[model samples]
Target chain A: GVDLLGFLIITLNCNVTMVGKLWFVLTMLLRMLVIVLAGRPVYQDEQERFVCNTLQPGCANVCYDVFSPVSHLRFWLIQGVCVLLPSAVFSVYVLHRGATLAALGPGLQVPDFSAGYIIHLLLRTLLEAAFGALHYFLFGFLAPKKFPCTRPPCTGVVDCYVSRPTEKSLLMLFLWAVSALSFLLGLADLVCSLRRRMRRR
Target chain B: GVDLLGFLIITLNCNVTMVGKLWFVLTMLLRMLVIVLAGRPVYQDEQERFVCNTLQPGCANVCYDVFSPVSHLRFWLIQGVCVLLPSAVFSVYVLHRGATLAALGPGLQVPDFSAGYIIHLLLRTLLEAAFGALHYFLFGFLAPKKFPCTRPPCTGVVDCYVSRPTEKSLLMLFLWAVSALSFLLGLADLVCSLRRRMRRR
Candidate 1:
């Protein structure tokens, strides 16, 4: 259990810098701007996508007017709540936990917050994975040929942001790099730990 | 195990819009650019942060030029890999899994990638949290009170980008809002799920 939150500290890998924070702010605010541009309420079904009204008769509570750009406004709201919300919580909590443990120094032990933290992370990850799956289920079909609106301004099957298949693949490729780094770091840690163990022996 | 990789996909959370992709590319390139700007090897000690030569000086065979700017570059690289990489991978994986399972149809069963996927997410989150904490440890000390350098051309503690305490707090405030949305949704889901369960009973 200690290893659960403990290993990361040992690895000395995490840190959020000002530049990173700056970037986070940059993307976040810019994200809102894009959302404003693509704002609308949309829902999906078997045949085609529809814009609905939830706001004042604009796109809210209104249904199946493909021409209604209200669906455009719905773009970021869905991504914002259903997608970013949970991950944001989980990530913040994770950062919180990391800082707490680091402050406690190098002893491997469960944090006072460990139990709740564990449950939260486990639940949140579950939630995150589930949420991601839902996003795909919604947009994968709408994306055409084989794509989905992975970003905002994506209202539904009928209308959303233009697709960029090439960029999508390229962006996703970076994921592999991240995983490789993890494995590499893990491997390095294992080797160093083993070497130290051998030296003690 | 199913729950492990399953939760995030259920929510419509994962997708990278053109704007997002544009940002990703922009940030990715700009990150590299920042790295170039702050490029140098640095080491931390009691007195000051030092930039050392690996080839000629090696670890022991290095020179400490206190005036060197390697420490500045070190800041973002730490962030790029230690902080950003795992989240990027996790985010990408979360999106990938969502899309794949969505294609398979509605059932909360695990995918073929379930096994490795679970392990990967667990490790990545742990690492991310740890890194975030470590980041606070380093930067909190360096930041002065509670401030961060929000833009590049930000070098180091002595000379970097000016700090934006107010904007920083405001941007971070949104993170809390995101989490609040998560909890609110969770509460709503719980209520709705319970209501349905009662009906089935």
Candidate 2:
């Protein structure tokens, strides 16, 4: 049985930084901001791509638009929300446990709040940062500067331009660099934390 | 005399989240990224604006460029670093204090590792979040969509276009919204933290 209120007391005495707890919140905000501001807009979708060698009316435009590998904004929005999901679950648990404690009047020994959560936060940081770094390489960093347009209408080869490709890639660079740094910092903390835990054992 | 080791021990027991510690790091990276990727490029400056009336060799181009107001990227880069400065100072203190602790042993009863840092982290979160919110309004949220190209351009009224103004404003909205959310979350944490401390008192 876990101490329902023990976690609260433990947190009160020596808990993770609130900012740490709020990390998901911050990231969530960043992600959403990026999505809302930079993410693909249906109206702008038509303008984002250019097709050559095709005199057809909608063929070139539709082909160019569909040919886009990914939208940076859209990718990050998905990434951001996915990364933040764990924290949401944890927070919900905290809320539920708190309610349980209040209803039961501390009669329950369930380990609702424990030193484990500190570890949870640490792990989350590691995971979030790791994901940030990984995603950077796989998705964040790589945006096609020029999409090769070769369709039924296109003759030899047409160069497709991604609107604001340079700036978008640069933005990812910023995001990924931060992720790389966070990964490093989070690793250090993990080492420190694990070392301390082992010492206690 | 302060007990440097004690502070460390205290931190080991209940330190702020590393992510929390790395909040500034993340913001810094984001800021720098914005600056490097999205901020003003000298080459693009001449291209970003156009003077309607003035067709002189260098008159319209130069005038249009100079007349432009704040650059979003530049402003955020500055804002990002400035906001992170406090965390830098705090981290440095931690490093120095840790070294001193190793040198002096437990001879001092100083309050190096007191529970105060929790408050510091909280305060920083508050300040950072607040700044995010405030800056969003003062700077982030507001980017001139159109700059008036009325500088001896010999024209009646010319609407100067800010390159990618819509996206830029949207980006700030995202950032500011995050700041606003963080501010709210930080406040909740602050209240909870203070409440706990008061009870202890």
Candidate 3:
């Protein structure tokens, strides 16, 4: 279990640094598999022909259209069910658990009352609020005027930032900071333990 | 142990979500007594006079000059120690752990993997490589050109990004995606389990 936890931590770190790379690779791999195994079935009939003809410009009309929108929809639908939905659920689950703890023992109380804990919590909260304000100022108010997106592909990208950019950035920063802080705090606890031992000596 | 594990997971999620409102309220409550009761020291020095006078233009004549390069140096030194150093350490720790895992056991032979494991491993490796490449591109090439910083405030903001942004973004996206994917896989596993149960019935 310790090894697994350690592996999870390391894996989490790797995930942090290589996100763009992962996205590019995953998309490419999925595309490659579709091309090799599924072929023209995944693409729009006209799009498939365009792609094939672009590859071999002078080839005789060999575009046997086997494009199935239903199949493509089904595949994505399954993926959405299998992937995106579950993640949302898990996030909710984790949030609920944390919220419950935060609401513990009634009277709106806070645990771990220490000077260090107070400093840590205050700094983290301020940082989060700052990020939120940045998001509200940045894309929410400013960027939209310059980078207008009224169509499908562009709309999706715009929509991505419309609600969650600040939340996402703040969350990411908070996690990274907290993870580092926790490790340091653990080290401090160890040092304190050593000091106690020395006092006993 | 299970409860502690559950609490850790909850805390981890809170850090990821940047939802530290409860944390702030609690910490403030905890520190209220100390902040109220303890008399903070007042400085009757030249720098203190300058700061006080700066608040109002009418008090300009009361200003006096005092400098401490050492104090400024100490602030930066502690910031580096508290923030940037820990992140660097965590990044290195994760990287080292990953390297060790790759080189672990039986001449580093691949395991008797299922299709699922193979896909997972391949995706994970590809993602890691992608992250490394992105970091190389962003910090090595892009950031320097976009945000040229020579001193003080400009340097502070740039330094903050240099220390945190790329790694934080990468990790955030990676974890969000992975958690989502895991949720989907778990659902699939559940379905399979149910199917097995029905077959037994």
Candidate 3 lDDT, A19-128, residue by residue in tens: 32232233233322223222222222223212211222232122222211233334333432332333244436444543455333221122221333334334433434
Best by lDDT: 2
Full-model lDDT for every candidate: 0.35, 0.50, 0.30
Q: TM per model? A: 0.22, 0.47, 0.19
Better structure of 2 and 3 per DockQ: 2
List CA RMSD, all candidates: 27.1, 13.3, 28.6
Could you give the DockQ of candidate 2?
A: 0.05
- Across residues B1-201, which tens digit of lDDT does each residue of candidate 2 receive? 333333445544344444443444545465446544554442243343443444433344434445533334434543555455555455545544443334433343434344656666566665675555655565634666666655553455455665556666676676665556545554555466556566967
lDDT (tens digit, per residue) of candidate 1 on A22-44: 33343344343323321111122
lDDT (tens digit, per residue) of candidate 3 on B89-116: 3334334333334423222222221233
lDDT tens digits by residue: candidate 2, A71-107: 4555666666666676667667666655555555632
Q: Candidate 1 — which residues are off by over 4 angstroms?
A: A1-112, A145-201, B1-31, B34-201
Estimate the TM-score for candidate 1. Answer: 0.22
Provide the lDDT at A143 for model 1: 27
Q: Summarize candidate 1's per-residue lDDT along B47-151 as a digit string, tens digits.
A: 122222222111210111122213322334444444345445455455444433433344444333333434443553455455446545654433222222222
In CAPRI terms, model 1 is classed as: incorrect
